[PDB]
Design a protein around this nucleic acid. Structure first.
Lengths: 129, 266, 188, 286, 169, 65
RNA sequence: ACGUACGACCAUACCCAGUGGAAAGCACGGCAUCCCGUCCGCUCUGCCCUAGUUAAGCCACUGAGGGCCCGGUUAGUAGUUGGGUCGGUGACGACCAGCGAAUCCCGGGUGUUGUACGU
RNA sequence: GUCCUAAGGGGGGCUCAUGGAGAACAGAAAUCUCCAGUAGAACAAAAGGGUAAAAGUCCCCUUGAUUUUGAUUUUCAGUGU
């Protein structure tokens, strides 16, 4: 049974611009990802209400954050026509940024975990182009 | 009242439409037995928030002169007084004295039964939290006499003592201690004061099953000397003021569910 | 085991004071056995507490808020004496009687504010009090002084205290009037 | 003239015993226990936080007429069960003690036959309410970065509703009215102590060894403090009622009764007092 | 039990006082003397009552003082005893274990003369204590120092003998 | 418009409810969606008239926030 | 039984001095980078719990001088209300009752107790 | 005749009058240090039991000089938002 939230747990600053997307980790509520208009995403430890990681590298507003279904990856899609994959347990970007969208990337969709094949994951990015 | 603090004290002590909770002054005479002092301590523990206690000896006989009681009511803004005494005729006496307009409204003496008195500390149970008002149960045939008597006035004083603070709402967790006063018509009848804690148990029904456990103190009184109020002072004390939020019903004028004022034509 | 008791005469309730009156007699045993005496007393207390909690849970409206589960209690109905007399309207003073006779209306709160707009300085200032308009010029660098007024002025006094003198005179007159009103009200 | 005379001793009025012992501020206590915004006759809880030289004492207290009652208690020496053996009085240990007390309270309440009137009168549109308590710091000074607020922060993170503001947390900037949550995280995970160890190991090696001789002996480096405190938090939230046994001598209660009564000095009786008085009188006569 | 290391006498505080008696430039120069001699900002003291004979009024700053603790207090006390040639009187020592004296010129203590400042005299007062004085000063559980722990006039005179190698007359 | 709070020229003008330039009026702000810190809905606020309605045929106001 | 943290009575607990304290805990203590505050890291605050030490705090016992707290005695007595009920024209003198002291004196004592965690 | 970012409110820290012993001027009376100090000082009222980690005294913040709403209470309204 899920009980109704009735009070503020934590108000955590850190973003210099309005926050555009937020999503919890599928593993537990301890890890939260927020992508904002300050060209960054951030990982928060919500148990203590503290920042944990700051993902930098985008040059546009991070319009979307999306955790992998197993929770081992975090994908951020931004206005700079890029999608970046990050390791949430270390805060480091995995491989390079994804290139090939002409315009703003607006939405992300991970392939379901039971459908992964060829020893890899697939990620669909929908864009303005 | 030059200072704002003294002005605040004067406004607090000023008469109001809705009154403050009454304050009880606990004081003793020159002779006061240890049983009487323990009983006063138990009553103060029952009424910690709205009581003040004196600690010196006062050579006052309340049924002979009450000018010093009126002076103490004036100074301490106390409307109830518990006065302890001891004597050869009356070994352990609690004199419940109620004021009106800083003058004595009525007085009643209680004689303690010493061999059956039990303090709160002699019961090994969980005790009442500070500031919690206990509920009241009055049992027996001595309280519905058609004429106003000592038992009726004792009931009124005990209601005014364990009244606490008024409240239009109460938490269901604040219904865990009960104070029971039992007295029967008849050689002198004995008024028994008991305090119990309340346990609730499942019974297969929505209404819970109430189980009691003794909390203390255990007091047995015999009603003693009696000072009835003056008639005019009694009507002045039983005048009930009207709250400004309590509207006066006007003929053919009402208020609907949206707050609009509605008139009725015939 | 039941949660409802049966007695020849029903209980009465005052849920404003959380009070139950049990008019049935308490058949105290005519023995000296303390534990059975306290057992009978505890049985009477248990019956009273049971019916009181049943009445509270049945005839009062229940509301679950963030504070908790609350029962709404009616206003108290048991008559209890007051500690002080019911307040009465104060006797009318001389000004109040004169205004009632002359139809003088009380000033509005916006009209009686301690604030006014000074045009010459183009600022907002108080009429009275600290730096009020009634003491205008006591701290001014230059004050015009009439020759006849200065000649009639007593030695030692200056123009800088004339406004304070007038305030002291008006305060003394108002104080005498209010003391007269208090004395008349004390006689009444 | 002698100020301390019979009149002075008769007129003298003693204070309260705990005021004489300097342990209770009764002026603040009265407003803590006997003042309420609402008069719904509800019980009130306080989180009492006290600090010693070697321990942190956190208790959950209700106030009754014959004495206070402890609902749950947590101590900083109990963190050795969760893996913290050094710095038991620092701000991070205060946070861990508060978190442990919060988890113990929730586990005792079941928020992690006899039944309540709340469950009896619960309606259809009823939700679980958080457990609420008020902070009792005692005589401690409530400055910015104090460890009583670390205990309160740990308990609030653990799940106890404590009404508070954030202007007394470490890292708060008073002119900008903002809280530096990086500094707050550093203090929670003990980064201030680790920075102290690194600064001492760079500047003054002898003071480093003297202050942290136990850290080097147990091989606890500065960089492991963050993972150690997070790891301890994980076991605190997992098993809040883990039993811990100390290195003190262990005996039963009756054995400790006998051991202390063996070192008690007995009070002499009336016959012994009269014998000593007679001996003193004989010595004065001789 | 007198050989316990926790009963060792030590200097608690040395208080440096200059009472010029008149506010203004003299008081500011005395404050600057106190500042340059100690290393910390001094304290201005106000007159409690009004005395027409001394020419002072209520709430008027007439004196200045500095409290110094640690080895700096020991160094300043050493300079003062060097001025007083390590000779004191038995009247100077109190029964509470504290002592003090006073000098007439700050120049001979080791400060070069500045004509813009002038000449000022000082009062030195040294307070002695044993370890355990936190009991009577701490906010929580403040209590009284025990009778055996109190420092007597003979004890502080003997300590002065064995430490500063001085003489008392 | 809920009420006329203060006409700057005369309290008589304020009582008569004259809508001129600089007049403080009370406006219904339900459509703007203003929520207070306590969660209550603010449905009445103060606005200042910034035009001349007698010359323009309309009342233009600016909220005082 | 001892210790600690919150307490209930608030001197039987207070004022002065001496003696002792196993275990653990308190406490004295050490250092001022960070949080924080002072004339002074004295106080407050942070860090260390390692090392010294029961010297002081704290606890127990003792000792005088005071003070304080109980019970009896005073004593149902002074005193105060009552033609109350008997005489006295009346005022009052006894008696009958109702309320009802204090001083002095004697004897005892110099803290009990709740919750929680430990030794 | 002068001076004041007014009073008030909240929070925090400290303990006062006095006596004893001491400190160049300083000497009954200047300032500073310790000890003892049931308040014997100060602030209000007129205690026959006001206030001591405060109701006293100093710091920080507000100083916005009389807020808004009300179908409710009382009075009034030929100018009844």
């Amino acid at each position: 049974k899920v009980h109704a939230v009735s009070r503020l747990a934590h108000r955590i600053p850190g973003h210099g611009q309005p926050i555009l997307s937020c999503q919890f980790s599928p593993v537990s509520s301890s890890r939260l990802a927020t992508g904002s208009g300050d060209n960054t995403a951030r990982i928060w430890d919500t148990d203590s209400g503290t920042p944990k990681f700051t993902l930098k590298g985008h040059t546009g507003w991070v319009l979307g954050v999306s955790w992998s279904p197993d929770g081992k990856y975090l994908a951020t899609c931004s206005m700079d026509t890029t999608v970046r994959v990050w390791d949430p347990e270390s805060g480091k970007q995995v491989n390079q940024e994804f290139r090939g969208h002409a315009k703003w990337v607006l939405a992300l969709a991970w392939q379901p975990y039971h459908l992964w094949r060829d020893g890899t994951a697939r990620l669909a990015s929908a864009s303005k182009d | 009242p030059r200072n704002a603090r003294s002005k605040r004290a004067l406004e607090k002590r000023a008469p109001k439409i809705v009154e403050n909770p009454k304050t009880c002054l606990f004081l003793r005479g020159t002779t006061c037995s240890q049983i009487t002092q323990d009983a006063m301590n138990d009553l103060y523990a029952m009424r910690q928030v709205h009581a003040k206690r004196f600690h010196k000896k006062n050579a006052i006989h309340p049924f002979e002169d009450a000018t010093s009681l009126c002076f103490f009511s004036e100074k301490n803004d106390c409307s109830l007084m518990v006065f302890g005494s001891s004597n050869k005729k009356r070994p352990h006496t609690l004199t419940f004295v109620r004021m009106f307009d800083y003058k004595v409204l009525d007085m009643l003496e209680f004689y303690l039964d010493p061999d059956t008195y039990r303090s709160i500390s002699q019961f090994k149970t969980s005790k009442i939290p500070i500031g919690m008002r206990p509920m009241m149960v009055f049992a027996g045939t001595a309280f519905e006499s058609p004429v106003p008597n000592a038992f009726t006035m004792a009931k009124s004083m005990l209601i005014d003592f364990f009244r606490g603070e008024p409240s239009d709402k109460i938490d269901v967790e604040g219904l865990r201690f009960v104070v029971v006063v039992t007295a029967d018509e008849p050689q002198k009848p004995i008024l028994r004061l008991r305090v119990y804690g309340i346990r609730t148990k499942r019974s297969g029904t929505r209404l819970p099953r109430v189980e009691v456990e003794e909390h203390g103190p255990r007091m047995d009184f015999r009603l003693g000397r009696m000072r009835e109020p003056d008639p005019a002072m009694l009507k002045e004390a039983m005048k009930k003021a009207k709250t400004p939020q309590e509207e006066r019903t006007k003929k053919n004028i009402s208020m609907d569910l949206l707050g609009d004022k509605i008139g009725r034509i015939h | 085991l039941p949660v409802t008791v049966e007695k020849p005469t029903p209980y009465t309730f005052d849920l404003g004071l959380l009070l139950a009156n049990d008019p049935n007699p308490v058949n105290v045993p005519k023995t000296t056995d303390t534990q059975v005496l306290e057992q009978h007393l505890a049985s009477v207390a248990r019956d009273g507490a049971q019916v009181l909690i049943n009445q509270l849970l049945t005839t009062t409206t229940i509301t679950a808020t963030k504070d908790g589960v609350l029962l709404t209690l009616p206003p108290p109905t048991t008559p209890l004496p007051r500690e002080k007399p019911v307040p009465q309207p104060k006797p009318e003073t001389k000004w109040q009687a004169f205004a009632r006779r002359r139809g003088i209306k009380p000033k509005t709160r916006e009209q009686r504010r301690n604030l006014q707009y000074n045009p010459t300085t183009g600022q907002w200032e108080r009429k009275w009090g600290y730096k009020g308009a009634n003491k205008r010029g006591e701290t001014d660098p230059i004050i015009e002084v009439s020759a006849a007024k200065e000649a009639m002025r007593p030695e030692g006094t200056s123009v800088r205290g004339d406004k304070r003198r007038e305030i002291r005179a008006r305060v003394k007159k108002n104080q005498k009037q209010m003391l007269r009103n208090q004395r008349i009200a004390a006689e009444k | 003239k002698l100020v301390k005379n019979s009149a002075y001793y008769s007129r003298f009025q003693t204070k309260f015993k705990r005021r004489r012992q300097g342990k209770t501020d009764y002026y603040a206590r009265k407003r803590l226990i006997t003042q309420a915004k609402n008069k719904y006759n509800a019980p009130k809880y306080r989180l009492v936080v006290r600090f010693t030289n070697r321990d942190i004492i956190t208790q959950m207290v209700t106030s009754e007429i014959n004495g206070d009652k402890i609902f749950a208690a947590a101590y900083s020496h109990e963190l050795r069960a969760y893996g913290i053996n050094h710095g038991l009085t620092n701000w991070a240990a205060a946070y861990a003690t508060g978190l442990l007390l919060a988890r113990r309270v929730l586990a005792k309440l079941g928020l992690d036959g006899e039944y309540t009137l709340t469950e009896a009168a619960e309606t259809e549109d009823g939700e679980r309410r958080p457990f609420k308590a008020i902070l009792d710091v005692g005589l401690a000074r409530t400055s910015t970065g104090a460890r009583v607020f670390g205990v309160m922060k740990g308990a609030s993170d653990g799940g106890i509703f404590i009404p508070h503001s954030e202007n007394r947390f470490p890292g708060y900037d008073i002119e900008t009215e903002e809280l530096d949550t990086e500094v707050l995280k550093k203090y929670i995970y003990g980064g201030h102590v680790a920075e102290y160890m690194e600064t001492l190991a760079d500047d003054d090696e002898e003071r480093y060894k003297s202050q942290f001789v136990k850290y080097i002996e147990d091989d606890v480096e500065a960089d492991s403090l963050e993972e150690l405190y997070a790891e301890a938090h994980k076991q605190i939230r997992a098993d809040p009622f883990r039993k811990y046994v100390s290195d003190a001598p262990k005996k039963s209660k009756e054995e400790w009764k006998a051991e202390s009564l063996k070192y008690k000095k007995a009070k002499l009786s009336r016959e012994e007092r009269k014998a000593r008085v007679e001996a003193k009188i004989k010595q004065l006569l001789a | 039990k007198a050989q316990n290391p926790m009963r060792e006498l030590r200097i608690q505080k040395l208080v440096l006082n200059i009472s010029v008696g008149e506010s203004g430039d003299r008081l500011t120069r005395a404050a600057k003397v106190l500042e340059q001699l100690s290393g910390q900002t001094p304290v201005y003291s106000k007159a409690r009552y009004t005395v027409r004979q001394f020419g002072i009024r209520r709430n008027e700053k007439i004196a200045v003082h500095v409290t110094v603790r640690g080895p700096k207090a020991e160094e300043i006390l050493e300079r003062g005893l060097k001025v007083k040639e390590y000779e004191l009187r038995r009247r100077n020592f109190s029964e509470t274990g504290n002592f003090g004296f006073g000098i007439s010129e700050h120049i001979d203590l080791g400060i070069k003369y500045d004509p813009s400042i002038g000449i000022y005299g000082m009062d030195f007062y040294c307070c002695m204590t044993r370890p355990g004085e936190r009991v009577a000063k701490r906010r929580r559980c403040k209590s009284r120092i025990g009778a055996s722990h109190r420092i007597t006039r003979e004890e502080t005179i003997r300590w002065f003998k064995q430490r500063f190698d001085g003489i008392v007359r | 418009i809920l009420s006329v709070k203060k006409n700057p020229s005369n309290p008589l003008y304020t009582q008569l409810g004259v809508l001129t330039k600089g007049t403080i009026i009370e406006v219904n702000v339900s459509d703007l969606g203003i929520v207070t810190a306590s969660g209550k809905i603010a449905w009445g606020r103060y606005a200042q008239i910034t035009n001349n309605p007698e010359n323009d045929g309309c009342v233009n106001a600016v909220l005082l926030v």
